[PDB]
């Protein structure tokens, strides 16, 4: 008299045995209920990474940050390097700057340490500020002071107990006349000396097209300094000297949207359940990616 239990439901499931079968309980595997919004990661509006590090004039609202976990930046920033140029090993810097723990800015070299060289008239009109020509506030464009250029032989000892990050640049003149009046030496070179790095460079003079305002170009480098080691500098022109260094202790999302361990450039993932069909490209952690729409299993009663 007793028979198999019969129940009711309003859902469907798929399998190999058929094309579509009704299911008593539709328990899914994926979800698409992403918020669509974002330690607190850095939230910059338009400043580029290179512009922020070099101190672009429109970045006065930043830098003073205790700690960040990852960088939020949109494609094609309008606050990029006003002066054309690029950074050698640029991708390496981004990879290193992914995890930084805390980030403290400290002036290793005071401004008064350059008595024989001039500083006031180093500005660029490419990225002016408050209606006046200006320049990056993290570096100094040393220029001829008294129609002479004494050799720079500064040095540092790094008496602290943490790693320091330094930056310096080399300027490429547009032609011979620019090199003639800005610097006394027709031929110049720079020299960098440390424990495990030797560097020698020379300016490059050649005609070039007009990309953005002036036709010159910038070249920037970076290095890592050991806690108990010294560094040395030597140059005879076209040198860019740093004013501030960044103190770090130890060891990227590209989109833009309004403000969990899983984050994607479109939203914040609030679940770690097996996977989902949402954007596979994530940062940090992601359950998994599947190119499908329906994955269901049933249980109960």
């Amino acid at each position: 008299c007793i028979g198999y239990h019969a129940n009711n439901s309003t859902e469907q499931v798929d399998t190999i045995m058929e094309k579509n079968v009704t299911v008593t309980h539709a328990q899914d595997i994926l979800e698409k209920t992403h918020n669509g919004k974002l330690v607190k990661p850095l939230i910059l509006k338009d400043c580029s990474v290179a512009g922020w590090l070099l101190g672009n004039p429109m970045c006065d609202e930043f830098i003073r940050v205790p700690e960040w976990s990852y960088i939020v930046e949109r494609a094609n920033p309008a606050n990029d390097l006003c002066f054309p140029g690029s950074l050698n090993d640029y991708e390496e810097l981004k990879h290193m700057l992914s995890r930084i723990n805390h980030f403290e800015k400290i002036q290793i070299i005071p401004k008064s340490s350059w008595p024989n060289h001039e500083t006031s008239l180093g500005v660029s009109a490419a990225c002016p500020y408050q209606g006046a020509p200006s320049f990056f506030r993290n570096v100094v464009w040393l220029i001829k002071k008294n129609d002479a250029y004494p050799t720079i032989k500064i040095s540092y000892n790094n008496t602290n107990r943490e790693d320091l990050l330094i930056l310096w640049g080399i300027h490429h003149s547009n032609n011979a006349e620019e090199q003639t009046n800005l610097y006394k030496n027709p031929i110049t070179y720079i020299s960098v000396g440390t424990s495990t790095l030797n560097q020698r460079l020379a300016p490059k003079i050649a005609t070039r097209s007009q990309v953005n305002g002036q036709r010159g170009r910038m070249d920037f480098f970076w290095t890592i300094l050991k806690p108990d080691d010294a560094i040395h500098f030597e140059s005879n022109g076209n040198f860019i000297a740093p004013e501030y260094a960044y103190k770090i202790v130890k060891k990227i999302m590209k989109s833009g949207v309004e403000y969990t361990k899983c984050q994607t450039p479109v939203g914040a993932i609030n679940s770690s359940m097996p996977f989902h069909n949402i954007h596979p490209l994530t940062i940090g952690e992601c359950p998994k990616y599947v190119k499908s729409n329906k994955l269901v299993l049933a249980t109960g009663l």
Partner: antibody, heavy 123, light 102 residues
């Protein structure tokens, strides 16, 4: 900003004369410089604009004034000169010198104005 | 070029400027100047609706579409504009307007 000018007066058509301008309220190595003319009835009219030595550049005169006028810059002594030659009767007007506001990539419009200088051409 | 219209205390008047799409637009780089008989030009409002320092409350205005309007308030007993042009050499000057007090 208390710029001081010099020169001016009456000259015969086709002659030559010079003006000069100086200032002391700001450093001169970071200031874009321009020179403008004010005429009765019509008003202002562009004459040219000068670059800065750090950024290269050259004096690009206006089309109606091209080929006769030139401007020289001397940041060492804080002096700007104007070279007028082959002038005619239509050049009679007052001229005002000024710096320019800096925006995006280049300067657009004046910021600080002098009190001017009248120049006349007549027979 | 950029054209302007031709020429009692306690009232409020508005002066407007008419340009063209090649000379005016959504850009914010439009100036306005004040002139007095026998005096030098002075800057009243350089960045639109960003009244400068060391000036009085008299001058205010806005911009919309192909024209911009400048409002003068509290007239007593006691004027040129320039617009953005692009990468071109310099901005275009416009005709002046004379105010009459009676």
């Amino acid at each position: 900003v208390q710029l001081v000018e010099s020169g001016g007066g009456l000259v015969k058509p086709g002659g030559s004369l010079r003006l000069s301008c100086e200032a002391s309220g700001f450093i001169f190595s970071n200031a874009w410089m321009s020179w403008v003319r004010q005429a009765p009835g019509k008003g202002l009219e562009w004459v040219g604009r000068i670059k800065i030595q750090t950024d290269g550049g050259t004096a690009d005169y206006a089309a109606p004034v091209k080929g006769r006028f030139t401007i020289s810059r001397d940041d060492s002594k804080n002096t700007l000169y104007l070279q007028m030659n082959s002038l005619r009767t239509e050049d009679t007007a007052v001229y005002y010198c000024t710096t320019l506001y800096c925006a995006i990539t280049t300067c657009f419009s004046p910021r600080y104005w002098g009190q001017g200088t009248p120049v006349t051409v007549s027979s | 070029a950029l054209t302007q219209p031709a020429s009692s205390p306690g009232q409020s008047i508005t002066i407007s400027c008419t340009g063209t799409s090649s000379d005016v637009g959504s850009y914010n780089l439009v100036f306005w100047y004040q002139q007095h008989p026998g005096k030098a030009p002075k800057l009243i409002i350089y960045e639109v609706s960003k009244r400068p320092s060391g000036v009085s409350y008299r001058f205010s205005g806005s911009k919309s579409g192909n024209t911009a309007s400048l409002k003068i308030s509290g007239l007593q007993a006691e004027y040129y504009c320039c617009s953005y042009v692009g990468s071109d050499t310099w901005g275009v000057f416009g005709g002046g307007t004379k105010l009459t007090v009676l």
